[PDB]
Structure formats: structure tokens, C-alpha cells
């Protein structure tokens, strides 16, 4: 894109929200839900050993 715009005209952007800022709370609530229930860890945390 090419612009006549000048005299201080410029382009800038708002950043994305990082969705892992919620996912690392979803992992923390799966640890609590496993702790309260006493299920084997792999029933909730399917990446665990």
C-alpha cells in the first residue's frame, strides 16, 4: 500500500491477546479438580504421565 499521507501520519496496531494466558489457568483448575475428586491424574490431565 502507498499513501500521500504525511505531516505525522503513520500506521500502528493493538496487540493480540495471548490465549495461553487463559490455558495456564485451565491447567491449574484441572489440578484442583483432580485433587478434590481423587480420580487418576490422566482422567483430567491427558498430557500427564
Amino acid at each position: 500500500l502507498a499513501f500521500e499521507g504525511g505531516e505525522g501520519a503513520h500506521a500502528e496496531q493493538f496487540s493480540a491477546a495471548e490465549l495461553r494466558n487463559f490455558v495456564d489457568a485451565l491447567d491449574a483448575l484441572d489440578r484442583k479438580a483432580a485433587s478434590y475428586s481423587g480420580l487418576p491424574p490422566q482422567y483430567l490431565s491427558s498430557s500427564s504421565d
Binding site: 500500500l1 502507498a2 499513501f3 500521500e4 499521507g5
Partner: protein, 124 residues
Amino acid sequence: ATLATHEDVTAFWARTPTAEEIVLINRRLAQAERMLLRAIPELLIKASSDPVFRAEVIDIEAEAVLRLVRNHEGYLSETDGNYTYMLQAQDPNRKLEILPEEWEVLGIVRSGLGILVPTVVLPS
């Protein structure tokens, strides 16, 4: 003759020209005419068919010439003791031009955004 005439320029100018400033006004009107006619090849067909388009052309020519003939001697001040004046420090009226906001009136609008498109020739 041109669409506008020296009677138009001397009406937007609040003053009457000498016969030496009249030939300048005619020469500048003939220069303004060709700029509009080159930008809009239809100009004479539109101006003879539509009276409000004619009205816009007539005073876009008259104001375009008025920007040059206004104070064309280049004086800032003069005196001879019993009288004197001083003018505003205007920017020099260097060349005849039509404003962007005058080109909008004839409908020859221009985009201030354009695109550069990369090309590569495709194989056989």
C-alpha cells in the same frame, strides 16, 4: 475565444485593469482554458449543454487567473510622503495552477491511496 472573459476576472478583482493588464488577463485565461480542456476533454460539450457546469468552469477559470494578476507587480510597499501603503506578506504567485479542491468541482477526483503490485513472469 475562451469560456471566461476579462469581464469575469475584473469582477472578482475589486479593481479595473489598464489596457496593458487586459492583454495579460486574456493570455492567462487562454492558459487556464487549456489546463481544464486537457484534464476534461468534454469541457466545451459540457459547458454548452449544462449551465451550472458552465457556471463552475467560468469562475474556476476567473479565480485561477485572479491568483496571478492580484498584485503581479510584486510590491510590498510604496510612498511619496503624503501617501503610503503596505501589503500583507503573501507567498509569491509563481505559476498558474488549479487547486485540488477546484478539481473536485469538475469531478476529476484523485485517490491518495495507491498500490504497488509485485510481478514475476510465470514459466513456459
